[PDB]
Design a protein around this ligand. Structure first.
Ligand SMILES: Cc1ncc(COP(=O)(O)O)c(CN[C@@H](CO)C(=O)O)c1O
Ligand SMILES: Cc1ncc(COP(=O)(O)O)c(CN[C@@H](CO)C(=O)O)c1O
Ligand SMILES: Cc1ncc(COP(=O)(O)O)c(CN[C@@H](CO)C(=O)O)c1O
Ligand SMILES: Cc1ncc(COP(=O)(O)O)c(CN[C@@H](CO)C(=O)O)c1O
Lengths: 458, 458, 458, 458
């Protein structure tokens, strides 16, 4: 029946969370947005924008759209353009993980994307190339949802009224994953008029953000957060903005996924946790309507990955649930089956020999013993690093001909072998290395660098 | 309003393809299945099967589901189980690309998967471990959609009737992506009864498949195809099965994606091409209803990737559309802009020296000249491979002390330097190597192995 | 007492070989030349030539010597020049052993050496740079012992007369390591005059040499052999030249070293074998005087090395004497200690997958089995190489989508695991690879290339 | 004439140094010992000891010699044994230059050598295996020149009397390379008796040695020096021992080689410098007799090598004489002529990203700038090492989510690009790294570790 796929955007259903809402609180339903053809709630802002531009006249037939497509934007924008038969050229933060720009290309959109994080002030960055293309090409258009009233108008038309119709105006508080504006600005501006002041418009934003009255910071939840107040936003709409920490967002997303079957992204998790928190000041009998405008399936590379979420130092439970042993043993090899080798420098060898052996085996810490490595029973005397000798060879306090036995540092303390990594790092907090002994024999050396590399590798 | 996310499965919309249907043919609409909460059309089978099992009694509350989850099954099955609060244990073909099992775990399903392609006949394979777990665990259940009448029952209940309601019974031919059966069987068995013989039930299956009366073969479109006739299928339902080639399937998928904004998987492309072909024997005024029960977003790793689709030797157009130059130059380096000294071997050096130099530079073909490499003007005389000498050192027809100048093979022919890779391979069809000359000087050597490696690397 | 070190050249002693002379033959004494200050018998030519040049006038005080120093020439020539206080500039085969040019530099001789084996015909080669320097520098001199009568005159003065004095003219046959001439010419021209025709002047030269009436060939015994007859040689002096094979020369050198304590070079071994052979036609009571004008200590890198003498395919006994087990086991690893599983490709995987897996593990031959690698009991069916598929992918007789099970070559035969390498190669003469089974299981694959690499590595 | 090669040991000539003696000092002649058949002065001790043992009775015919062979011992010992037809088994300190044990094997001596520097106190070391073999094998003998009066007896018989005969007792002072004592003890004990007190017996020993009344230390001149007073030495013989520094020994050896054509080892250089110094307290008209009992040709690997003598931090002139600056440019690559990227980590990327990028490119110091690397003009603001972040990630003073712009260390100072390495290290003495700018742009980073690695690699 539908004339085109684009005419299925909207009418997103509502679900009732049952495991993410502590007992005794009112119903907290969620509006999922990944059921739309574009896979993201943004395709709505897209269609409206395209309709408005076509009705305006500044975009003649046969023109070319151009703007920095963060990623999901190209989705809806290219969808609409292909529906009507337009072109799509995207110049955005190179960030776009390979998958993002691969998908954007798949929808028939030429990309000349340029690296981000570099303030151009000249044609030497992503916004630089974007502006250069805008100046160059004819019949183009810079939608720039950041500053476009039609953006929020879209939501004011068919983003909040749908919520009212589904809930029949029986919604106490509407939280939203604040961003450029739209969703929040439009949803609040609509829900407030039809209910006077009966509804509170909450706003979720990662801590340390401008919307929360803080300072700048890097971002890990794509789409949310910003540093310069976009002209398409007005705080007068929201009642009070509630901040949320990143560490409590990804964990919330994983929880929600395992307990309510919502493979949503990160912004959805942030909104969910925010809403949850809001659900306390309002007593029971209240209906909280949260929004999850990101279906997380391309996010499965990192957010649900056990490594990427471990590099940033927050993973409160492994995906499989059950915590597992991660003995330093495998951590000590990461390639060897039994063990790599207890590299040692007998205390009679020359300092140059020790420095060379360290430079050849790629280590920055090594014990020095008298007898052979294997037979050693933990009586090692010397403990030579790599930075100390390098700082002593030039400081005149040593000479290559000198024997290492007169410059060895105090023997670095040893720790367990089968112990969990967690304790290993906890102990590493007070020392820059340690000697792992295998059942009672010095078997290897562990340094913070290696532990971090192992934990981040996967 | 919805009690749970699972209660949004069904009611998939219909779209009208406008660029994949040659003019003059009747309307060929498609039913997309990736708008469901599970992201795949299989979740409907999941819900029906779970309902039937619960109503039966063989799955008591607090039990545990267990079966080989191809990948998307893990989606719907775990969705339903989490809705009702069950467990999920999957033992399937290790195939499941990292993303597949990562997503399955994300939905809270313990996986003890096992490698596939190995006929166990004992506890040594994926089905082996599946059967062992089935025998071991209590309160379990082996759904095995392959043999479950309730599977096709679901399609017969709420998979075809929806099509009839949307089209009001005005559907000439219904093509489907025949798989373990389901849709192909349920949809036909329903549509036929309400329309007598007014509707033809077409079936799409990759060539060289049992459903098409052929021989076994590997698979590249997950879900489709099979070798042993599943007990849950009956060919008496379909009117006539139409086969399709793999090479014309992925290309069709990419085409459909770029021309109708349908980021569907591969099986969808196969079904689309099938119907497309069927749309000829039936004249205009006919209404065709194709099915695309796979939303391709996790497929973006390979199907829309420019490399994976190139390793299998079929890519009729690069994703960006415009064909690009891929001269042997970069192909000759893969790691450099200049050029590693065209590994040479003066015809006076000993054969042992040449074999050693080849073994050290990792090459299997090298020209031998008199003067220095750079100044050479294409008068190279010798052309020594690596297999010939190895076959001559042991065949008594040569000795290490011998000079290479008495065993060099005829000088291998040279080709262009800036020429496209396509011509390079076309010419390589008649020789096992060639000497690429850079503007008029022998610069490198190209062998089929290196060309394939370059084309498959990306 | 000696005014300078150079005045100790000459008066080399004579020794009696007792283990290199089969019983029943006459005494065969040897004149060692490595007891001179220069370490080589050539220094005598150096001193004579320098004396002649100084007495002539074409080399004024403060001049500069220049000529291509094969290696030991740099010894005596620089010795004399430093004695009198001259300079030394050497342009010769760059392939002059590293140790060789290091030693030459140590004696205070600037080297601008150039690569050899390249016929310059222009300023692009070792002789090219030598001639350019000769033309450029003033007060220079090109000794070029190749064409200098004073060279042989040196021997005629104080190289043969010493032999006569030591033996009192009681020498039947004098063999010598014929080279640029010198000893072979001077010694004979002197010994013949004082004994009429009582002494036969034998000449030793590696087979396939111009001096032996043969064809050109590469050289492995530095100093001996040549292709163009030097103008400083006259065959009318020698009685009859006897050729010798290289394979019987190095072995003779090692034998002599172990049985007579003569750490001499290779030319010495060739001369020794020559005389040894000559000692048969002449009955007992004859006194043979061989010459060993090369003390082999810098030759200990290769000649006495167990690897370099193995790369050229002749080593009739290991240095330690006792033959040792090699076993393909270690030959199968060459790294770590245990065999890395076994590259396997199940016969259901796609051909592209097999080619990629071969390209990633760096192998050119692999068996294909049904079950897992370890449990396999030698029932492997497929045997796919790397050249066959590459020749079949382009020959139209296969396609990447095709299954490897329809193109596998006949399963390559297996051999023993603990067997000696000797038998391994002997069997490899009839096949290009084999499957090494470890106690009854296919453990690895062995190819001629790997065996040669192992034997040449050491 | 000679019955065997061993009967040429002795009668070493004397030479007059002309460039290593200061004008105005008396003649300082040297006795070279590398003209003997064994190549070392030790062979004389070998012959004497073998004669004594044979005449004693504790070594019956058909026995087996066994003792720890340093490097030249096996030479003479095996020479004598092969002359008489004995066996040779050597268990000595490991490290023995590969060449050393290769040569020892060449003379037909089985070696079961064991690692050194490990105090066994059990069969776990070189002396351990030596003692075990001595206990095990029958008909053996432990010569142990360390404690054998016949050792010094040899020198007393035919090591000093030869000096007296050559100089006719006209020798003022005899310096010697004191080692186990044998040489010096015998020479002094003989020369003193025939001249009363007319001759001073000087002794040369590297500084920081027991013979010089100092403390223990590693050794770099093989043969000289010792820690425990050998029982075969008596200081009552020498008049006064003069010490010498290692740094002034190798340089003296190289000087002597270039200026007097004496390719002697290191101990010879030490003795020469000793005598040289002694030649001052004694006025002109004095005749000094130095000893060089080591012909350095196997030492050409390191002593005359430009790298090994550079690793130990003393090389006062390159072998070729002319100094040639080694600009940091090549030092900054060691892989090519162009620096391969420096850093693009702008002060906005996350700390985890920076640590990962450092861990991937193998660096411990990197600048952080705003714009692109190339266009940068030296306005870099951040300077992040690798140890600081690792010490801040665990110290609670930072978190992975934090931005690096709040933890960057003060920007490390820059230095020149074409400047000589010497100045580079001199400046590095005050900092642990620097930023090398290429003509005015930051091109790379230099750290002490890299400089040392470059200087030691060669
Ligand atoms: C999950 C998620 N939630 C919300 C937003 C922004 O919408 P808002 O400003 O109404 O919050 C985004 C941004 N994504 C949009 C930008 O608005 C895009 O064009 O791709 C998002 O990815
Ligand atoms: C695109 C597509 N179309 C159809 C099917 C199978 O459904 P059918 O047997 O009714 O054809 C699959 C298999 N996918 C299902 C198996 O039925 C799964 O559990 O993941 C599929 O991926
Ligand atoms: C062992 C041996 N025997 C002989 C010769 C040449 O001397 P001849 O020409 O008198 O035979 C050489 C060459 N070595 C000389 C070249 O004459 C050199 O300058 O190094 C040699 O190495
Ligand atoms: C240059 C030099 N000078 C002297 C000695 C020892 O002799 P001495 O103890 O008489 O001094 C050595 C040791 N070299 C002997 C050990 O005596 C060896 O067997 O190799 C030496 O290398």
């Amino acid at each position: 029946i539908a004339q085109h796929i684009s005419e299925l955007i909207g009418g997103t259903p509502l679900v009732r969370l049952n495991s993410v809402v502590p007992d005794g609180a009112g119903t907290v339903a969620a509006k999922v947005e990944y059921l739309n053809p574009g896979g993201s709630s943004k395709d709505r802002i897209a269609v409206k924008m395209i309709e408005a531009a076509e009705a305006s006249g500044q975009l003649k037939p046969g023109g070319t759209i151009v703007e920095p497509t963060s990623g999901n934007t190209g989705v809806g924008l290219a969808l609409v353009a292909q529906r009507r038969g337009y072109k799509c050229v995207f110049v955005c933060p190179d960030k776009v993980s390979e998958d993002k720009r691969n998908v954007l290309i798949a929808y028939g959109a030429e990309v000349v994307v340029c690296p981000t994080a570099v303030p151009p002030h000249d044609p030497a960055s992503y916004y630089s190339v974007s502006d250069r293309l805008v100046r160059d090409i004819d019949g183009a258009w810079k939608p720039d949802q950041y500053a476009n009233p039609e953006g929020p108008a879209s939501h004011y038309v068919t983003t909040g009224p749908e919520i009212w119709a589904d809930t029949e105006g029986k919604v106490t508080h509407f939280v939203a994953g604040i961003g450029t504006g739209g969703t929040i600005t439009g949803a609040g501006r609509y829900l407030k008029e039809v209910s006077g002041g009966r509804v509170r418009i909450v706003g979720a934003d990662p801590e340390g953000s401008v919307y929360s009255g803080g300072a700048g910071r890097p971002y890990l939840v794509e789409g949310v957060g910003e540093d310069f107040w976009p002209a398409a936003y007005d705080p007068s709409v929201p009642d009070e903005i509630i901040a949320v920490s990143d560490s409590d967002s990804f964990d919330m997303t994983r929880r929600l996924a395992r307990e309510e079957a919502m493979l949503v992204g990160g912004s959805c998790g942030m909104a969910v946790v925010a809403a949850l928190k809001v659900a306390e000041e309002a007593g029971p009998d209240a209906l909280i309507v949260v929004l999850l405008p990101d279906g997380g399936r391309g996010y499965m590379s990192k957010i649900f990955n056990d490594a990427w979420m471990s590099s940033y130092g927050f993973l409160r439970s492994r995906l499989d649930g059950s915590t597992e042993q991660s003995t330093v043993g495998d951590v000590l090899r990461r390639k060897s089956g039994a063990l790599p080798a207890l590299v040692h420098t007998h205390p009679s060898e020359t300092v140059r020999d020790a420095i060379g052996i360290l430079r050849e085996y790629g280590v920055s810490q090594m014990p020095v013993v008298g007898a052979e490595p294997p037979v050693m029973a933990g009586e090692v005397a010397g403990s030579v690093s790599e930075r100390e000798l390098l700082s002593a060879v030039f400081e005149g306090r040593a000479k290559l001909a000198d024997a290492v036995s007169a410059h060895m540092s105090p023997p670095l303390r040893m720790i367990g072998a089968g112990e969990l990594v967690s304790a290993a790092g906890k102990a590493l907090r007070d020392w820059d290395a340690l000697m792992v002994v295998e059942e009672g024999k010095p078997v290897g050396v562990i340094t913070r660098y290696d532990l971090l590399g192992f934990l981040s590798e996967g």
